[PDB]
Amino acid sequence: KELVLALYDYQEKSPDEVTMKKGDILTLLNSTNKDWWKVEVNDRQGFVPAAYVKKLD
d(CA 34, CA 3): 17
Cα-based torsion angle of the residue sequence 14, 18, 21, 25 in order, rounded to the nearest 10 degrees: -150
DSSP state for residue 10 in the 8-state scheme = B
Backbone angles phi, psi at 51, to 5 degrees: -70, -20
Query: Which helix (H) or strand (E) covers residue 40, if one does?
Result: strand 36-41
- For 4, residues 6+ apart whose C-beta sits below 8 A from its C-beta are 25, 26, 28, 37, 39, 53, 54, 55, 56
Resolution attained, angstroms: 1.6
Q: How far is CA 38 from CA 30, 52, in A?
A: 5, 12
CB–CB of 10/52 below 8 Å?
yes
Q: Do the Cβ atoms of 50 and 35 come closer than 8 Å?
A: yes
Fold classification of 1-57 is SH3 type barrels. (2.30.30)
